[PDB]
């Protein structure tokens, strides 16, 4: 009722084999494109699904074994032999970057519209892809710390200012998936090890601060020993000109007793509406209000395992991909969210917070 739930595309319907519909081969940097690396008789290829053009599919052979699209532009990044990276504008045919890293890339993701992020066995790096220095290697941000040892790296996120960063690894510990995050402040050149499976940097407009957002970091964890889930929201880098500060928030994330090996797989936030969308691997969607941390809604949108996710619809929602190749989207209903909070949550104060932030009806 308080959300719209839709299917963006069925990847099996486009002829993609199940062996490629997983974290190894399918990437989702934004709601604009899905990229599937495929292989056939020794030859690699890319299927680029353009969600902004009726799920139009571009199919091309390539020499690399990993490929991602830019969040908005027709710019493809391709990798071979671990270390060799080339980045091309598909429209102009221009080569934007061509370099070899010192160590194999084991994870990458666009951090912003300008900057591509890389994680190796021991290092975390970024590339200013559009600066025109075609052969310049990625710059070292920081060495990986011991807390990410023996993990599979599954995310790398940054704030828009590109001075706060988080790298997420998971490991299996006593038959449960534990999450480890290296949080890095570029300004202080210091890292901090925290427990968490998911992370994002976002912004919130608080009363008193005019049109200037404050920055918050949102992270979700599931304690591998107790099973207890926890969402936390905390401010970073407060501009002293702004009188209103974000007060730290902590909320429970509920996991049923029989979802033993489940954990948070993704978190996206609507800045405009102040809504946190948290998805689990088993396909449970959780909504929280950003200002207060209040739990709004919990449901299950799929019984198939989710492996990746991205912002949806001008970053006001979340889209995800499951192992059956279904690309699913959730966003709040702008007409029904305030009535739901008012009538179903019986929370007049929260209803007003949401209505006022979003310019929404119902209050």
């Amino acid at each position: 009722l308080p959300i719209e739930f839709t299917e963006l595309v069925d990847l099996m319907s486009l002829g993609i084999s199940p062996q490629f519909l997983d974290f190894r081969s399918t990437t989702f940097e934004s709601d604009h494109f899905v990229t599937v690396r495929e292989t056939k008789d020794g030859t690699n290829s890319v299927a680029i699904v353009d969600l902004a053009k009726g799920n139009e599919v571009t199919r091309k052979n390539m020499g690399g074994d990993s490929a991602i699209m830019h969040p908005s532009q027709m710019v493809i990044s391709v990798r071979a032999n671990g270390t060799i990276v080339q980045i091309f504008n598909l429209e102009t045919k221009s080569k934007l970057k061509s370099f070899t890293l010192d160590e194999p890339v084991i994870f990458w993701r666009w951090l912003s519209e300008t900057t591509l992020g890389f994680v190796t066995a021991r290092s975390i790096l970024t590339s200013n892809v559009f600066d025109g220095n075609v052969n310049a290697k990625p710059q070292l941000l920081t060495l990986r710390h011991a807390n990410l040892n023996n993990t599979q790296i599954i995310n790398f996120v940054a704030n828009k200012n590109l001075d706060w960063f988080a790298v997420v690894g998971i490991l299996q510990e006593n038959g449960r998936i534990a999450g480890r995050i290296q949080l890095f402040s570029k300004q202080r050149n210091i890292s901090q090890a925290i427990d968490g499976h998911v992370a994002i940097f976002t912004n919130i407009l608080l009363e008193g601060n005019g049109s200037t957002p404050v920055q918050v970091f949102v992270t979700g964890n599931r304690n591998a020993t107790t099973g207890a889930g926890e969402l936390r929201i905390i401010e970073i880098d407060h501009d002293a000109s702004l009188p209103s500060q974000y007060q730290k928030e902590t909320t429970d994330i509920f996991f049923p007793p029989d979802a033993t090996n489940d954990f948070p797989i993704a978190v996206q936030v609507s800045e405009k509406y102040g809504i946190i969308y948290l998805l689990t691997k088993y396909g449970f969607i959780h909504l929280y209000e950003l200002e207060t941390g209040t739990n709004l809604f919990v449901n299950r949108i799929t019984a198939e395992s989710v492996f990746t996710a991205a912002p949806y619809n001008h970053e006001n929602g979340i889209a995800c991909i499951n192992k059956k190749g279904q690309v699913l989207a959730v966003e709040i209903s702008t007409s029904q969210i305030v009535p739901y909070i008012l009538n179903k949550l019986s929370n007049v104060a929260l209803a007003l917070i949401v209505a006022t932030r979003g310019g929404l009806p119902g209050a």
Partner: peptide, 7 residues
């Protein structure tokens, strides 16, 4: 090195 993709 050869282009990893030919456009």
């Amino acid at each position: 090195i050869p282009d990893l993709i030919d456009l």
